[PDB]
């Protein structure tokens, strides 16, 4: 939970512009669009990084390259790399960051319209963000289905396999015989229907507020390289203010930058602490932290 600024430069002033826009439009709400950057301070090992215990266990197992672990044809051929990843990443093995708790503060103040997330942690929900405000664009472990017929399975049947030494005898469907997996969106599958359907309602909400008060969309801790999520920032209305809190300028904010775009080069946890101070909400934050 302690943070520091990324460089000698202060970002307090940029962050103060953000707080200034919410003080001027006090019943306006914010849409957040987040990725793996916001969960780095929680100690979630990156499966692409050498140097993690996960990476070396997956290499030992003959995984050809990291993202094969999220590839349906590979999993069908050999489910063990996926099961080993799950055993290490499964919810309940980490705790939410100070950034995750900022979202829950924004909900308590009724200024959260929706969070769109690329992460399959579920730390937004664990932190107490309501179901109706979350869109887990790449799925989670909380549902499971037969890859062959779609039959539904409680998540606990897959869970119970991961506590076994060694892991063998994978979940198989009692109707068709194919593998059952978690509802994690693998590369090459479509996203859940609620992704497109809710962005459709929220795109319409963004346009209608510019003609009345004014809304804010803040993108944090993502490289905007995975589609179709990363088509979102380009689809934000021309007249709706966009903020990027990211170690680097990426995506549509580097390709096609907009006069009102605000870029803040800062660690998501440090961003959270500066925003809460520039908002005046120190007291209700502190209390959420110590529960």
């Amino acid at each position: 939970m302690a943070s520091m600024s990324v460089s000698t430069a202060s970002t307090e002033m940029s962050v103060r512009k953000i707080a200034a826009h919410m003080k001027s439009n006090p019943n306006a709400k914010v849409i957040f669009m987040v990725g793996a950057g916001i969960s780095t301070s929680c100690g979630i090992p990156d499966f692409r990084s050498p140097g993690t215990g996960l990476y070396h266990n997956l290499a030992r197992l003959k995984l050809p390259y990291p993202e094969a672990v999220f590839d349906v044809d590979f999993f069908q051929s050999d489910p063990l790399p996926f099961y080993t990843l799950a055993k290490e990443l499964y919810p309940g093995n980490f705790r939410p960051s100070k950034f995750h708790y900022l979202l829950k503060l924004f909900q308590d103040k009724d200024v959260l319209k929706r969070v769109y997330t690329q992460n399959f942690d579920t730390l937004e929900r664990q932190a107490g963000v309501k179901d109706d405000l979350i869109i887990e664009a790449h799925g989670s472990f909380a549902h499971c289905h037969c890859i062959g017929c779609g039959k539904v399975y409680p998540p606990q049947v897959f869970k119970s396999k991961l506590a076994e030494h060694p892991i063998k005898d994978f979940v198989k469907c009692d109707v068709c015989g194919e593998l059952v997996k978690p509802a994690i969106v693998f590369f090459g599958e479509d996203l859940p229907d609620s992704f497109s359907e809710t962005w459709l309602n929220d795109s319409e909400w963004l346009r209608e507020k510019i003609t009345t008060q004014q809304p804010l969309v803040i993108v944090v801790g993502t490289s905007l390289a995975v589609y179709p999520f990363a088509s979102l920032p380009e689809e934000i209305p021309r007249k709706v203010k966009r903020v990027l809190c990211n170690l680097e300028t990426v995506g549509d904010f580097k390709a096609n930058k907009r006069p009102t775009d605000l870029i803040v080069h800062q660690y998501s946890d440090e961003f959270a602490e500066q925003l809460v101070e520039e908002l005046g909400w120190q007291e209700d934050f502190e209390k959420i932290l110590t529960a």
Partner: peptide, 7 residues
Amino acid sequence: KGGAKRH
């Protein structure tokens, strides 16, 4: 919808 999860 946007297509399938890709780079």
